[PDB]
Symmetry: D2
């Protein structure tokens, strides 16, 4: 039974990490972006994730973000720390830091690059969980970036590791999504792919964690509500609108396209991702500007 992490369910923005033209942490843009999310009406933030550019950061720089975010939002919203690295030891330290700063849960993407066994994946989550010292874990499953494809049985076994009470399921397999839900009726189950949120909710996901929620996170809230109320037509209406914007972001690069729109909304000073992520192309700037305006009026 997963009633232990039931408080973690809902729509949660995957926190982008702001930087300057020196490629340093921009801490005033982080604060600005957190508060911006809080006032959109988000249920929480997922910090230092892929969307967070965690794998172009030092542990120190991840800790500094963790610390600021908690200072800004602890007790206002649910806060989840993505602590995952390839190394178990690196992931434990981050997991220790998140605890110190008063996060509500820790999370880790399956460790990547080297092909570790399933046994070696489970020991890893147990290690972080223990270092989390009371914080429940969100298993992050994002096969398209990690190259770790997990089966149902494997997943099943991970989300019943003691101390686990949630799954970031960034997978387009909406059959697997239903099986997870049918099998784990209590489990907090984060639809992971913004562009399928509605369908994912329908298949048994009870919220999400996504990149695009930083710039229109109320639209996703509307989807949850519209389907709890039997208004499929508005849920569809909202998903379509979300996906015209995801279409744009895909063309421009997702995280830096998001950053750019946050720049025009007066939230982020410098809309750059860390190298080797290049700059957005100037030809999308008119469409990212127009989008910044559409979304502020809404």
């Amino acid at each position: 039974h997963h009633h232990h992490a039931t408080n973690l369910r809902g729509v949660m923005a995957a926190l982008l990490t702001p930087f300057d033209q020196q490629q340093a942490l921009d801490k005033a843009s982080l604060r600005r972006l957190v508060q911006f999310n809080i006032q959109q009406g988000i249920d929480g933030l997922y910090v230092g994730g892929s969307t967070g550019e965690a794998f172009v950061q030092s542990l120190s720089e991840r800790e500094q973000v963790l610390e600021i975010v908690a200072e800004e939002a602890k007790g206002k919203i649910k806060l989840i720390a993505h602590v995952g690295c390839v190394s178990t030891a690196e992931s434990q330290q981050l997991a220790a830091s998140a605890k110190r700063y008063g996060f509500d849960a820790v999370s880790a993407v399956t460790p990547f690059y080297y092909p570790f066994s399933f046994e070696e994946h489970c020991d890893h989550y147990r290690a972080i969980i223990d270092s989390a010292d009371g914080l429940p874990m969100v298993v992050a499953n994002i096969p398209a970036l990690s190259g770790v494809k997990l089966t149902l049985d494997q997943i099943n076994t991970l989300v019943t590791l003691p101390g686990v009470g949630a799954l970031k399921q960034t997978s387009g397999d909406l059959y697997q999504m239903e099986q997870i839900r049918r099998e784990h009726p209590d489990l907090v189950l984060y639809n992971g792919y913004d562009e399928i949120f509605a369908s994912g909710l329908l298949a048994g996901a009870d919220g999400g964690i996504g990149s695009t929620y930083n710039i229109m996170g109320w639209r996703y809230q509307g989807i949850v509500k519209a389907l709890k109320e039997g208004d499929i037509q508005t849920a569809q209406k909202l998903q379509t609108e979300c996906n015209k914007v995801i279409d744009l972001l895909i063309k421009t690069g997702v995280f830096r396209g998001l950053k750019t729109v946050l720049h025009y909304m007066d939230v982020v000073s410098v809309p750059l991702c860390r190298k080797p992520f290049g700059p957005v192309d100037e030809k999308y700037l008119p469409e990212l500007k127009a989008l910044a305006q559409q979304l502020m009026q809404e």
Copy 2:
């Protein structure tokens, strides 16, 4: 191709004990499908085992289904072969037997360029002589890895009137619907039917519809009426069944269920497919019984 919209059963081809066509079980299976209230039949598809059948065999199934159901339901003829000329031969015959549409899976095995693929479909469309084309995108089988730009061009070929989308990618499903608002769009994976309609499918084609096409019609109804709980419940019960069938092999597992339901005389597929494993038989009867209660 407006009136092609709906829940269409991907018809299984029955075989006798010596692995020839079973004409009797077949006719039984078609009527059994009409009973359940299906909107139409996709004849001689992947589920149909067309790729372990001769052209004349595929034509024999085709003529016989039209005879059982023409007028009563919509009938789509999967005429797809690796060869353009073979494919054309089945298109010409669907025409003759009075079929409503033809369909075709992307030619497989040999890498064919997108240009050649496009040409494949224009030939078959001309040989189908006014019968609208159903494009079948079934990458898990064919290995053809089609994009949106590619799909967009296929579905907007003159003659093309519908897409069978056997893809799990419900972003692309929503994407296709938005570019082509008039397109007949068939969710192809039973096991996401509800989620697929939600993303923009307007009907479906499926193998498991042969044994519970009413549950799919129930998911179209419940969604239509804002009835969210019921659809999810109805999708869930389908997935408990597909769970099993995946353990048993979808095609022969369906066939057995229909064996226990009095429609199919011998529940075998064509070699290289093997028998259903005997440990599973009880649950397939259990499921036969339970589904026979239901309707």
Copy 3:
């Protein structure tokens, strides 16, 4: 004692005509052309031979004709493989009637089959060939089937399997297979690695390009046996120079066009849905033919 199937064996092309019917006259030529090249034998009606865009009957008339032109002069393997066991079984007995030396089959495709189902498919075709050695044909790029080494080891140990056509690029596996089966007849399937495939432990080859330059591939076998490495590397690199162009052209229609300017194949068409050769490639394929004729 199937060790007499060892050799360089051209994956025969199946000529069609203007209207896509078989071109039996150009086919008989191509058989006799191949016999001139000093080829050890022919692999008939494989993937190179556009098997799967032909009817069983067309495939049967090709096999017959080859057996008319070549039986007892070279070796002859008949590719009889289909998705259907029963249809593959029609083709093997037919291959047995025409006096072929061997049958072959690619892993049945399109539908996934369990590995148990594959062995039975092989087991059954073997019964229908009635004593002809079976060449199991592993071609992942086209078939989509992904055999493991234990699964390959199991397949070559089935009663009646004499050989393996290993169209993989994985030459760790090529070596592993040799090590498990020192007397296995092991054909290299990718022509663009032939020499390196021999070094890993193939003892011959099967390939589409042997149709136009098989003697180079016999040049390579000799070279290696001579211990001459520069020659073996030059020949391989020369084959890869041609293969580079055949992939720009599309290899099968490329080969038919080289043979068409070698005035051997009457019309250079593969069956639809394949298209003809991009018009703007003709000068190269022309020169390469002139080139290759001057060479032989």
Copy 4:
């Protein structure tokens, strides 16, 4: 590529040994370095995937670069693998190795996030800048990184200013030959040990590898075999190398090699960093034997 000919040869992928608490076992690193020079290795590839880079901080990687300079400068060629995901991090590692006097720097194509090809080019370019004269060895490792380069993409990367070499860890020997035929003077390392001979036949003029840490001499033995034109010997060695690689694949390659390195008492603790677990129990018999076999035939 002329400018880098001196980098041709058989280079061991240096492992990074750790003590019972997973720290840099500094004395063991020093021993392995000398063991490789005492094998007759042409050079050392340091801080790579076999070197367990991505379970280490920049600090620890710099320490290993630092120590290996001490042991190996002026004795054998030294290549530092400086690659990270973040460019700025790789650039730090690249200046370090220039400061320590390495002969060349190397980076595997940045991974996890899917970067466009321009973004890969710029990254080598900016890592090159920091290496300030040191040649760049581009490292193509699809199995691990998940980055699949087309032939033209490889051709563009190996002719970026300052690139002299390519670690081609890919069993596609057609491509190997195309790479050779397209750049006759490029230093082309065969990355997959299980196909060294065939790799060297297709156009590779050397190698970088993990198993070389326990049997380099066989791989050099293969080079000579093929220079002489004795395919019989080339084949025999390649076969023996693959019998061991067969075993290491079963055990875990990097942990396998660290375990044989224990039984030559070259390495103190044979562990890899978590989430690499320990080698299984049933495999310790074969590896001991293997160590003893490898010492006995060494002399």
